[PDB]
Amino acid sequence: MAEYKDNLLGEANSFLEVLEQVSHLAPLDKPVLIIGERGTGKELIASRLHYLSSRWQGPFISLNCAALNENLLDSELFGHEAGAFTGAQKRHPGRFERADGGTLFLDELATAPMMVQEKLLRVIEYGELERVGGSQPLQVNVRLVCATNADLPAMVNEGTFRADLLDRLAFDVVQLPPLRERESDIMLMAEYFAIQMCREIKLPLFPGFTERARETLLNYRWPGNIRELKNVVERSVYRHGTSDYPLDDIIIDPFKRRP
DNA sequence: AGACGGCTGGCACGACTTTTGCCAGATCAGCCCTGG
Numbered sequence: 001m002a003e004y005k006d007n008l009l010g011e012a013n014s015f016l017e018v019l020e021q022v023s024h025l026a027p028l029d030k031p032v033l034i035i036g037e038r039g040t041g042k043e044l045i046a047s048r049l050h051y052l053s054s055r056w057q058g059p060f061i062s063l064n065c066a067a068l069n070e071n072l073l074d075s076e077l078f079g080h081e082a083g084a085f086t087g088a089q090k091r092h093p094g095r096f097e098r099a100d101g102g103t104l105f106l107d108e109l110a111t112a113p114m115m116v117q118e119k120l121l122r123v124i125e126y127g128e129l130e131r132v133g134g135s136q137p138l139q140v141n142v143r144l145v146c147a148t149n150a151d152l153p154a155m156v157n158e159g160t161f162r163a164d165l166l167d168r169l170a171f172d173v174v175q176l177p178p179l180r181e182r183e184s185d186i187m188l189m190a191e192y193f194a195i196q197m198c199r200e201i202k203l204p205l206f207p208g209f210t211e212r213a214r215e216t217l218l219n220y221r222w223p224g225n226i227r228e229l230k231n232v233v234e235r236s237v238y239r240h241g242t243s244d245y246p247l248d249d250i251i252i253d254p255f256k257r258r259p
Numbered sequence: 260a261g262a263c264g265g266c267t268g269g270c271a272c273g274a275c276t277t278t279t280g281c282c283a284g285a286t287c288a289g290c291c292c293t294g295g
């Protein structure tokens with residue numbers, strides 16, 4: 001293991017609590033699930049669970065759920081023996097078999113085709129899956145790790161998620177807290193971000209914030225979570241222009257009329 | 260002398276031949292290293 005200084009700021013305790021939980025599960029072997037609001041740093045957390053385990057070496061496949069072809073996934077997952085079907089001429093490695101020793105990270109697990117929810121089924125349990133047209137079975141020691149943003153309990157009843165394919169993906173959820181909740185955290189990430197954008201309009205230095213911005217932001221409920229401060233804060237800098245004086249007003253929304 | 264019929268050959272269009280272009284891989288057996 002190591003440290004891997006990853007740009008993931010904000011004390012707020014809620015962050016400390018999830019990090020403690022996330023850090024504690026780093027040496028595990030059981031699949032975890034991250035439930036959080038869209039754009040709450042879920043990506044960071046996925047990636048936390050690997051570069052912190054006892055295999056910071058293994059591979060690390062992205063595995064989008066809606067990124068799959070679907071018609072031809074029966075070989076995009078396990079993958080195949082060269083010559084299994086017309087056209088085949090070289091063995092191809094399934095994502096799972098890619099990811100042996102490493103860990104898979106299904107982005108947006110909620111949005112997934114029904115067919116893909118069943119196929120996966122046995123790749124998770126035990127570790128038996130043979131390539132399409134394959135002559136023998138094998139093993140896979142790829143720890144599973146995925147995170148969503150849409151709630152899954154409702155989905156299980158709704159039938160969009162197999163009632164049975166739920167006990168088996170999640171052994172633990174790391175459920176991140178909402179932006180508004182952290183409220184300490186505001187200020188800080190703001191400021192880190194300002195200077196962020198400051199590097200890149202070629203400018204010397206960011207004068208700061210007026211009280212007027214203190215109020216604007218804090219009053220604002222942030223329903224876009226981490227990006228709201230970024231999209232909102234970085235956008236303000238463009239409007240701010242000259243660095244001689246500190247900015248006081250930042251618009252909440254790009255949408256609607258300007259006069 | 261002018262029109263009609265015959266002849267040949269160029270060109271076109273399907274039905275059909277033929278000619279060129281691929282590029283390993285996995286699997287099995289003997290020998291060397293090591294455990295019993």
Ligand SMILES: Nc1ncnc2c1ncn2[C@@H]1O[C@H](COP(=O)(O)OP(=O)(O)O)[C@@H](O)[C@H]1O
Pocket residue numbers: 007008009010036037038039040041042043044189226227230
């Ligand atoms: N704790 C944090 N502090 C500062 N910025 C963050 C934090 N977590 C995420 N971000 C930034 O905000 C964006 C939110 O998107 P992302 O992290 O992908 O969330 P999700 O994966 O849930 O969609 C990211 O691009 C990331 O750079």
